[PDB]
Write a protein that binds this ligand. Structure first.
Ligand SMILES: O=C(Cc1ccc(O)cc1)Nc1ncc(-c2ccc(O)cc2)nc1Cc1ccccc1
Length: 310
């Protein structure tokens, strides 16, 4: 089976260099963060968090829809995109969280922040919210790490694949063969990316070896109760319980159709009260198939949240 280019994409296409020229770099702890900042309307802040294999580039066609209503800030996570590397070479969830929260404290953020999370980027937003429950205005999430994996009731039995990624054979798949960037990323986009678009995802991880570590450390953080990292499992248990009780926190979930393990994620997402559910066509990286529909849904949601707090 093959995929085809979107014939109208090249006229709107934003290349890697075009995106990176719109970004800025700032020191954060012992390293630095590359990020996009739309600057205007700073009384609110909408922070977009990518997950594994991607970078701020993922949001490039989504964010213009929201910039007119609120300041939009989009980082490259540490070790990813054009950001600096982690000082100790470690890329666990808490390593990312350490750099991400240090970056927040330098951005002049409002008291209450809006988060937009994908993949493990949503796990970071959820953990931040659990630890700063008075700093959260709204949360948008999608194809997200919503809860632990405790059984195969909703999740397909992925045990054999998890054992693979945790093995030395999985390490070679990532560090030598770039599995998540070269294979998973295009497999989980419906359209075919333009060559320049794939090149922007490939560029941080173009060289073999240890530079690819973040794309191996992320799946090894999976919150599988039996065999997962117990510190990550606890983080996810804690913020899941918080989210299930957060009746007063308005949320938006963008379902992807047919998505990627969608059923398990939706069933977890349904347990969080005050969630508006919308749906777009896509797989895992739904930003690359329905960015304008997503941007419009997010814009209306933010507008509604702002109008009803006032
Ligand atoms: O890594 C995870 C973590 C997770 C996600 C959601 C959740 O409720 C609990 C834990 N899941 C995962 N589990 C399996 C695979 C996977 C499976 C097969 C394959 O060929 C490639 C990747 N990928 C992933 C990455 C992923 C999927 C969906 C949403 C976020 C992150």
């Amino acid at each position: 089976t093959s995929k085809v280019y979107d014939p109208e994409q090249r006229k709107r296409m934003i290349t890697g260099p075009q995106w990176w020229a719109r970004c800025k770099q700032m020191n954060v702890l012992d390293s630095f963060i590359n990020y996009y900042d739309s600057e205007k309307h700073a009384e609110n802040a909408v922070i977009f968090l990518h997950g594994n294999a991607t970078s701020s580039y993922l949001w490039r066609h989504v964010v213009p829809h929201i910039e007119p209503v609120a300041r939009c800030i989009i980082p490259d996570l540490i070790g990813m995109g054009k950001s600096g590397k982690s000082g100790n070479g470690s890329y666990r969830l808490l390593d990312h969280y350490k750099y991400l929260t240090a970056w927040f404290e330098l951005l002049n953020l409002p008291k209450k922040i809006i988060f937009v999370g994908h993949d493990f980027g949503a796990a970071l937003a959820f953990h931040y919210a659990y630890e700063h429950q008075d700093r959260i205005k709204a949360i948008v999430h999608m194809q997200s790490v919503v809860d632990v994996i405790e059984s195969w009731d909703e999740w397909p039995d992925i045990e054999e694949d998890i054992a693979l990624i945790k093995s030395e054979e999985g390490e070679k798949m990532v560090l030598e063969n770039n599995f998540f960037v070269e294979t998973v990323l295009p497999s989980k986009i419906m359209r075919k990316l333009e060559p320049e678009e794939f090149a922007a995802y490939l560029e941080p991880f173009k060289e073999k070896g240890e530079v690819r570590r973040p794309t191996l450390s992320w799946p090894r953080e999976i919150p599988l109760v039996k065999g997962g990292k117990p510190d990550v499992v606890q983080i996810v248990r804690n913020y899941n319980a918080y989210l299930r009780a957060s009746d007063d926190l308005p949320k938006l979930f963008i379902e992807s159709d047919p998505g990627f393990f969608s059923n398990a994620i939706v069933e977890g997402a349904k347990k969080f009260p005050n969630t508006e559910f919308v749906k777009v066509k896509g797989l895992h990286f739904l930003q690359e198939d329905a960015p304008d529909e997503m941007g419009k849904y997010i814009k209306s949601f933010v507008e509604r949240v702002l109008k009803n707090e006032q």
